Design an enzyme around this catalytic site. Structure first.
Site, PDB file in Angstrom:
ATOM      1  N   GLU A 793      11.765  19.752  38.774  1.00 47.99           N
ATOM      2  CA  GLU A 793      12.235  19.259  37.487  1.00 47.99           C
ATOM      3  C   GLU A 793      12.813  20.448  36.736  1.00 47.99           C
ATOM      4  O   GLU A 793      12.102  21.423  36.472  1.00 47.99           O
ATOM      5  CB  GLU A 793      11.089  18.580  36.737  1.00 47.99           C
ATOM      6  CG  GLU A 793      10.515  17.354  37.486  1.00 47.99           C
ATOM      7  CD  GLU A 793      11.561  16.253  37.756  1.00 47.99           C
ATOM      8  OE1 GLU A 793      11.825  15.422  36.858  1.00 47.99           O
ATOM      9  OE2 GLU A 793      12.121  16.209  38.869  1.00 47.99           O
ATOM     10  N   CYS A 827      13.105  22.071  27.368  1.00 44.37           N
ATOM     11  CA  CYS A 827      14.113  21.663  28.335  1.00 44.37           C
ATOM     12  C   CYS A 827      14.966  20.518  27.801  1.00 44.37           C
ATOM     13  O   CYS A 827      16.118  20.358  28.213  1.00 44.37           O
ATOM     14  CB  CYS A 827      13.442  21.262  29.644  1.00 44.37           C
ATOM     15  SG  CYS A 827      12.241  19.923  29.462  1.00 44.37           S
TER      16      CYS A 827
END
Ligand SMILES: Cc1cc2nc3c(=O)[nH]c(=O)nc-3n(C[C@H](O)[C@H](O)[C@H](O)COP(=O)(O)OP(=O)(O)OC[C@H]3O[C@@H](n4cnc5c(N)ncnc54)[C@H](O)[C@@H]3O)c2cc1C
Ligand SMILES: NC(=O)c1ccc[n+]([C@@H]2O[C@H](COP(=O)([O-])OP(=O)(O)OC[C@H]3O[C@@H](n4cnc5c(N)ncnc54)[C@H](O)[C@@H]3O)[C@@H](O)[C@H]2O)c1
Ligand SMILES: O=C(O)C1SCCS1
Ligand SMILES: [Mg+2]
EC number: 1.5.5.2
Length: 1216
Positions: A793, A827
């Site tokens: 991820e 993020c």
């Protein structure tokens, strides 16, 4: 160097006995609040009978003069549908924006009536408001295509006459009904008629929630100029018979909050004092309106200082609102009455019910707090109001009560409670302009009840009106509102005069919470318990948190290599606070590469023993760890604040997220895992620094509960909070052999990934490091000869698109949060803001003004908004990007940093105005917002540009228009979408989080497919199915039957049924939000077949899940796909050069072990995104229908829609 947390959140003043009693009631259970209110509101039988008789007489008068509204009469006259009425009023609104009356009439006559209204910003930007006016119902977004059709239809049917009537109707409502006047002079002129009848006025210069210093200055000079006009008109009538003004403190400072209390007392208070001095000189009332619950106690500190200030002595015009829907109301009144006695000021106290109910419910749910600060049953607010009115009526020598209500039952109860003795100045009633005059024309005057009423009169142009106006229309349309029920024929007068005090007393459980509103802890019902947060506006919470945070800073935090056999020795260094390197947080002993290899072998040896612990018991460990983390939250906050540079709010969210992962994966385990879902084996969990407890815990918890022993390798920047999380998990029952902690840098991560017994890798971090891990794993196969699973991820290049229908203030708030919270080190953080050209200048000016109100510094102070960047190397990398842009001529806006930041590593929030989106190359992980402008017709091209980066993590859209939502959300390619809200939401099980492309492999963390990746045979997730069958799959199955490939045709039909493509769910969450979860195709899947039957099985799997394919041309299987149907051929291409024909979204491979290894290496060498590869032998394809798992051939998409963005909550309008 200042001591840690020594100045975290000191109160403005020591809290008196009376102030502490207010704080104690903030979130008191509803069953405890009501009994004393019922007792206080009790009246004698004779009074209750007389009040019911007075209320009946008032209601019979109201219904006897009730006439149909002008809008209803217009809809009736021209037989308009609801959408036609709404579209007509939007057109009228737009026509009235043409100032020259003769110019408007010419446009209507020669252009609008002549059909083409479109030729001459959407017409329907404000249709949600007009929808309330026409229909009484609130829709959050506008169906602008329905409205455009309705407007064309009505004009083509009825022509200029209906347009004329619409214009004249809108002109009356906007100029005479919504506001008392457009300017204070106009409002004063219009007040003469009712002042002669015995009314008085309080004027509100419409305005609230300043975003910038310039906004606050503007509202200040508006208030100042209104005080002069009102005072000149008052001409000595005084504070009771003459007019006054009402102000909102949030209009006068852009950071009006408990977190900025010092700035509020230093900067806001002198401004209020200056306005009050002017009101004193004219001898007019000045009322402080009440706002959100988390501003109540802060406002008391301003009230106290002003009432004790000798410069204001001699004047009794200071006023203050208290909200009876709030649990603190009687204690607030106790405080105010005592302050009035101490100061000798006869404080004007406006008792209201309250205007922010919907928003208070949502806020408490989002924040996971213990209870609500308001009642949840409307009748409770009524009892609260009457009880507080009894308290005020006993104190009329020291305060001036002002009973603001439109409810004739409430009014009658107070009128009789007050008794026979009255004089002007003893108390008054109050009502809102355009709502209360019919009722109070039955009250004011010697011929009626001979009690005065003050009208609250809004003043402002059509523009400044929105927020206030929606709150009124919601109030007017809510099922529980008196002004709505009075007009309901199904509601009898007996129902309207029912005594709420006696109804509440007779309920079986006095004060029970509303049945249909969930406490924040119960948002998910029986599935799991919601994590709990902390109220940083509660002085008791701030006091206890200060102690706990200081104690956390005295602890000798360490992190050690924790192998199954015990702690190991290694190289030791200190861990320093990124906001001040003088603050040593703890010590870390890092893992040798030899011990990392040893740990994996110990994990392999222990793997059978942990797999043998039944899933329910593994899940019980996770639940126990979550309880431990909840109890230790204050200490965990202190560690996260000092180790990772997080603010207190962000640390709370971080710990909540860890608790939610633990409970979510525990519940998903109890729903799914059985004996046949065998674990992979030792799993290497590598985690990033920026969510150093939440993502760390989530990966480890999922791997453990799936039955895998774990090697935990935390980021080198943040080992201490990781070691504490492992300590908590081991205390909760995870055996030491099942969870080993290996601190250190990427060398330790790489040694773990490379270890022979590593059966799976969970990586969250940068795309470039994930690519190195992908290359390491391409060398490797499991003992069964299959690829080692990798969940990777990675980064984002996240955009928000804003069109000309969005509300600038909402946008700017969500941009400041999304881009600069945690110094942009999320993020999900907003990297590229895209502004429609026509509104870009206004939004940018507002954004830059908001930027300059942020406080950057060391994060052990509640007043700090933005902390440091994690390291000097991160700082250097970010600044190099800023300077590269600065050197290219781009406009750069930066906050100035205080000198105290020099002991740490800080980057100031930065705005960079770009020319093209291709100006950005890679993710810049810092507080750097890029801004681009676009023309409306280029919207589709802009979505292309956003997709063209190759990332696909978070994406935001701010618009009110359904056509634009449908267009943008259907074309954007990102894993987490957000409509009319910020883009940093990752609530576990609500917005399952994770993206596509360069942003991730999936499956999503905090979602239902995650655990299935960590076992050898995936279970069926809860709710995971679809009744839809891909039509190209169906065509392919028919083609297979035509070719004689009967068994493959049956396998294809089975894949079509088994596929969950088209799954479309709404996930439980907070009120005022819709949280959606859907399964889409991934994209183009690379097929590397070895045999004809293998190719057919691969094609069936890919088509059943909605994908296109690129088939390896070196397979030589071209002759196997002759004469495909055109529908299937459209989805099929043949690739000789895989790197030329990407990017792919996954891959399916057939072959023996060495063929799979060779293909895996070739796939890893493709440029761009990591591919989720599935491999099988020809024999496995023949034996196992699930050789290729359809879970990994679809793409998860989460979408979170703020349905309260239009100003209120439609669903809660029917909840009372
Ligand atoms: C002149 C004037 C000034 C005002 N100033 C302010 C102000 O500064 N700040 C402010 O916050 N409000 C203020 N209000 C109040 C607010 O704007 C509404 O007008 C008022 O709450 C409506 O109450 P009511 O007695 O007219 O009607 P009602 O129909 O009797 O009461 C409606 C109220 O019940 C409450 N309610 C509805 N549903 C529930 C529920 N399920 N559970 C618990 N409570 C519920 C809400 O407060 C709602 O407004 C003011 C009102 C007036 C008339
Ligand atoms: N998609 C998501 O959910 C998500 C969430 C948070 C952060 N991120 C991304 O994470 C990045 C920031 O976190 P970070 O700076 O800690 O990332 P990073 O890539 O620098 O390091 C992450 C981890 O990998 C380890 N590492 C470094 N080199 C390695 C190697 N050669 N082999 C094995 N391990 C190695 C590091 O020690 C660390 O534990 C950002 O790009 C952010 O976007 C993504
Ligand atoms: O504006 C609002 O919603 C409230 S404050 C005074 C009138 S009612
Ligand atoms: Mg790094």
């Amino acid at each position: 160097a200042p001591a840690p947390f020594a100045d975290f959140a000191p109160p403005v003043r020591p809290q008196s006995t009376l102030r502490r009693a207010i704080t104690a009631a903030y979130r008191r259970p509803e069953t405890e609040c009501l009994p004393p209110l019922v007792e206080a509101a009790t009246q004698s039988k004779e009074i209750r009978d007389a009040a019911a008789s007075t209320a009946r007489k008032l209601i019979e008068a109201l219904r006897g003069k009730h006439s149909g509204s002008g809008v209803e009469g217009l809809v009736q006259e021209y037989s308009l549908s609801s959408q036609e009425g709404v579209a007509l009023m939007c057109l009228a609104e737009a026509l009235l924006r043409i100032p020259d009356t003769a110019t408007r009439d010419a446009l209507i006559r020669d252009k609008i009536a002549d059909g083409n209204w479109k030729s001459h910003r959407s017409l329907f930007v404000n249709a949600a408001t007009w929808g309330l006016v026409v229909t009484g119902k609130l829709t959050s977004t506008v169906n602008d295509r329905s409205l455009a059709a309705a407007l064309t239809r009505l004009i083509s049917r009825c022509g200029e006459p209906v347009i004329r009537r619409g214009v004249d109707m809108a002109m009356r409502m906007m100029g005479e009904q919504f506001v008392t006047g457009e300017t204070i002079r106009e409002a004063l002129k219009r007040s003469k008629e009712l002042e002669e009848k015995g009314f008085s006025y309080s004027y509100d210069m419409l305005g609230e929630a300043a975003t910038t210093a310039a906004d606050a200055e503007r509202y200040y000079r508006d208030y100042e100029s209104a005080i002069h006009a009102i005072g000149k008109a008052s001409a000595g009538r005084g504070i009771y018979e003459g007019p006054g003004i009402s102000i909102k403190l949030s209009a006068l400072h852009p950071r009006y909050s408990r977190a900025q209390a010092a700035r509020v007392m230093g900067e806001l208070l002198p401004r209020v004092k200056a306005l009050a001095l002017l009101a004193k000189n004219y001898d007019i009332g000045l009322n402080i309106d009440a706002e959100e619950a988390d501003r109540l106690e802060l406002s008391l500190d301003l009230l106290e200082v002003l009432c004790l200030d000798g410069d204001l002595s001699g004047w009794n015009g200071m006023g203050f609102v208290v909200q009876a829907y709030g649990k603190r109301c009687p204690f607030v009144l106790d405080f105010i009455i005592d302050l009035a006695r101490r100061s000798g000021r006869r404080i004007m106290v406006r008792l209201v019910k309250g205007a922010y109910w919907d928003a208070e419910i949502k806020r408490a749910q989002l924040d996971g707090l213990a209870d609500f600060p308001v009642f949840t049953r409307k009748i409770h607010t009524d009892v609260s109001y009457i009880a507080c009115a009894a308290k005020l009526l006993a104190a009329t020598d020291v305060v001036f009560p002002q009973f603001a209500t439109h409810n004739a039952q409430t009014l009658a109860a107070i009128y009789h409670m007050a008794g026979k003795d009255f004089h002007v100045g003893k108390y008054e009633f109050q009502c809102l302009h355009g709502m209360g005059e019919p009722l109070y024309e039955e009250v004011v005057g010697r011929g009626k009840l001979d009690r005065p009423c003050r009208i609250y009169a809004p003043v402002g142009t059509h523009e400044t009106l929105l927020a206030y106006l929606v709150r009124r229309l919601l109030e007017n349309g809510a099922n529980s509102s008196f002004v709505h029920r009075i007009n309901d024929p199904k509601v009898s007068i007996d129902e309207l005069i029912a005594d709420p005090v006696e109804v509440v007393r007779a309920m079986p459980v006095v004060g029970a919470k509303h049945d249909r509103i969930a406490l924040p802890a119960e948002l998910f019902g029986d599935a799991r318990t919601n994590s709990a947060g902390l109220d940083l506006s509660n002085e008791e919470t701030l006091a206890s948190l200060t102690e706990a945070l200081r104690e956390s800073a005295a602890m000798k935090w360490t992190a050690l290599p924790q192998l199954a056999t015990g702690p190991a020795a290694g190289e030791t260094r200190t861990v320093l606070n990124p906001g001040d390197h003088r603050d040593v947080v703890g010590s870390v002993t890092e893992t040798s590469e030899e011990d990392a290899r040893r740990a994996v072998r110990l994990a392999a040896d222990a793997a059978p023993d942990w797999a043998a612990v039944p899933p329910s018991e593994r899940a019980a460990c996770l639940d126990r760890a979550a309880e431990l983390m909840q109890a230790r939250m204050p200490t965990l906050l202190g560690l996260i604040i000092r180790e990772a540079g997080k603010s207190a709010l962000n640390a709370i969210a971080e710990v909540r997220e860890a608790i939610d992962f633990l409970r979510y994966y525990a519940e998903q385990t109890r729903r799914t895992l059985g004996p046949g879902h065998g674990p992979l084996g030792p799993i290497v969990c590598i985690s990033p620094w920026n969510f150093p407890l939440a993502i760390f815990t989530g990966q480890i918890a999922a791997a453990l509960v799936a039955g895998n022993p774990v090697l935990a390798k935390p980021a080198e920047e943040t080992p201490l909070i990781a070691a504490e999380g492992v300590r908590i998990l081991r205390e909760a029952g995870i055996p030491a052999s099942a969870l080993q902690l290996l601190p250190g840098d990427g060398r330790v991560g790489a040694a773990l990934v490379a270890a022979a017994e590593t059966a799976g890798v969970m990586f969250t971090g940068s795309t470039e490091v994930a690519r190195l891990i992908q290359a390491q794993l391409a060398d490797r196969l499991s003992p069964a000869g299959r690829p080692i699973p990798l969940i990777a991820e990675t980064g984002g290049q996240n955009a928000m698109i804003v069109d000309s229908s969005a509300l600038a203030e909402q946008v700017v708030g969500d941009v400041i949060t999304s881009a600069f919270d945690s110094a942009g080190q999320r993020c999900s953080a907003l990297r590229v803001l895209c502004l429609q050209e026509d509104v870009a200048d206004r939004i940018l000016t507002m954004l830059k003004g908001a930027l300059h109100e942020l406080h950057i510094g060391r994060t052990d102070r509640l007043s700090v908004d933005v902390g440091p960047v994690i390291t000097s190397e991160a700082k250097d990398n970010i600044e190099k990007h800023i300077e590269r842009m600065r050197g290219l001529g781009r406009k750069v806006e930066q906050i100035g940093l205080a000198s105290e930041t020099g002991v740490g590593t800080f980057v100031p929030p930065t705005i960079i105005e770009l020319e093209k989106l291709s100006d950005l190359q890679r993710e810049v992980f810092g507080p750097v917002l890029h801004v681009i402008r676009y023309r409306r017709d280029d919207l589709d091209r802009l979505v292309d540009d956003v997709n063209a980066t190759g990332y696909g993590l978070t994406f935001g859209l701010h618009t009110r228009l359904d056509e634009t939502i449908a267009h943008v959300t259907s074309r954007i390619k990102a894993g987490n979408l957000y409509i009319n809200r910020n883009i940093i939401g990752a609530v576990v099980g609500v917005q399952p989080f994770g993206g596509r492309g360069l942003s991730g492999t999936g499956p999503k963390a905090g979602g239902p497919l995650y655990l299935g990746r960590l076992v050898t045979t995936a279970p069926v997730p809860p709710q995971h199915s679809s009744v839809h069958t891909d039509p190209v799959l169906l065509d392919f199955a028919k083609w297979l039957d035509g070719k004689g490939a009967r068994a493959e045709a049956e396998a294809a039909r089975n894949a079509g049924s088994s596929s969950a493509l088209g799954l479309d769910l709404e996930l439980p969450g907070p009120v005022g939000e819709r949280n959606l979860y859907t399964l889409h195709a991934r994209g183009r899947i690379l097929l590397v077949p070895a045999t004809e039957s293998g190719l057919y099985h691969q094609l069936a799997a890919a088509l059943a899940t909605g994908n296109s394919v690129a088939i390896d041309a070196a397979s030589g299987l071209q002759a196997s796909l002759k004469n495909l149907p055109q529908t299937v051929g459209l989805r099929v291409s043949w690739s000789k050069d895989w790197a030329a024909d990407g990017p792919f979204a996954g891959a399916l491979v057939e072959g023996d072990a060495e063929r799979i290894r060779a293909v895996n290496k070739a796939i890893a060498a493709l440029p761009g995104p990591l591919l989720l590869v599935q491999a099988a032998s020809s024999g496995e394809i023949a034996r196992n229908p699930d050789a290729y798992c359809l879970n990994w051939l679809v793409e998860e998409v989460s979408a979170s829609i703020n349905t309260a963005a239009a100003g209120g909550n439609a669903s809660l309008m029917a909840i009372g």
